[PDB]
Design a protein around this motif. Sequence first.
Motif, short mmCIF file in Angstrom:
data_model
loop_
_atom_site.label_atom_id
_atom_site.label_comp_id
_atom_site.label_asym_id
_atom_site.label_seq_id
_atom_site.Cartn_x
_atom_site.Cartn_y
_atom_site.Cartn_z
N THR A 111 1.74 -12.97 7.82
CA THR A 111 2.36 -11.99 6.94
C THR A 111 1.29 -11.09 6.37
O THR A 111 0.12 -11.49 6.22
CB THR A 111 3.15 -12.66 5.79
OG1 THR A 111 2.32 -13.62 5.14
CG2 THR A 111 4.35 -13.37 6.35
N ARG A 131 0.63 -8.20 3.17
CA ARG A 131 1.20 -7.62 1.95
C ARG A 131 0.43 -6.39 1.53
O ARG A 131 -0.80 -6.40 1.46
CB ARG A 131 1.20 -8.63 0.80
CG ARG A 131 2.06 -9.86 1.09
CD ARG A 131 2.01 -10.86 -0.07
NE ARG A 131 3.00 -11.90 0.14
CZ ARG A 131 3.38 -12.79 -0.77
NH1 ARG A 131 2.87 -12.78 -1.99
NH2 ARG A 131 4.31 -13.69 -0.45
N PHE A 176 0.39 -3.89 -1.63
CA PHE A 176 0.82 -3.95 -3.03
C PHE A 176 0.91 -2.56 -3.61
O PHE A 176 0.05 -1.72 -3.35
CB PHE A 176 -0.17 -4.77 -3.83
CG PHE A 176 -0.36 -6.17 -3.29
CD1 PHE A 176 0.50 -7.19 -3.67
CD2 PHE A 176 -1.39 -6.44 -2.41
CE1 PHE A 176 0.33 -8.48 -3.18
CE2 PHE A 176 -1.57 -7.74 -1.90
CZ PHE A 176 -0.70 -8.75 -2.30
N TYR A 232 5.33 -5.60 -3.86
CA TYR A 232 4.62 -5.59 -2.59
C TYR A 232 5.58 -5.47 -1.43
O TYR A 232 6.71 -5.94 -1.50
CB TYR A 232 3.72 -6.81 -2.41
CG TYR A 232 4.44 -8.13 -2.42
CD1 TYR A 232 4.80 -8.76 -1.22
CD2 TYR A 232 4.78 -8.74 -3.62
CE1 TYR A 232 5.47 -9.99 -1.24
CE2 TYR A 232 5.44 -9.95 -3.64
CZ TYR A 232 5.78 -10.57 -2.45
OH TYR A 232 6.45 -11.77 -2.48
N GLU A 256 6.13 -6.84 2.21
CA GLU A 256 5.67 -7.93 3.07
C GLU A 256 6.11 -7.66 4.49
O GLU A 256 7.30 -7.58 4.78
CB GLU A 256 6.23 -9.28 2.61
CG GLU A 256 5.74 -10.43 3.49
CD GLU A 256 6.01 -11.79 2.86
OE1 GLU A 256 7.11 -12.34 3.08
OE2 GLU A 256 5.12 -12.30 2.15
#
Length: 158
Positions: free
Chosen positions: A44, A46, A48, A86, A88
Amino acid sequence: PVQVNSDLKLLFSNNGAAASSNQIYMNMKLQNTGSSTYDLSKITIRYFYTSDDDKALTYYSDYVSIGSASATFNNLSPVHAKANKYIEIKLASGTLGAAGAQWPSQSEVTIQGRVAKADWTNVDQSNDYSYPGSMSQFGENKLVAVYYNGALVYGTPP
């Protein structure tokens, strides 16, 4: 948190996007520099950011060199001066092979995505934690985090 060892490295660019932009650009290359193999379904990423005011966002998957990518938008906690949300990104399938392995095994994957609102409005990325400034060429953006099975392998979360 603590970054667990891996041979994973993220390169990032955003097409030189400025702080003021019509959409967020995310072009990423995730590389495996070592002799292990990694399952992309366990990765994954992220990115932000700070939400103006909870306007609806859409993730556009333009190009993914192995498998496919999808995205969710999520509340961040605890909040950061530069991020209350965020994106994802999850990769669905495929394998990052060992560095140097024979075609068609591949040791890196390219992910190109964009995030935009629906209402024609622009984004001020100067307030987004993961926005690194203009990056036309792939470089280090340590403000984007990568996880493998939920464990941090690259970057610095807020």
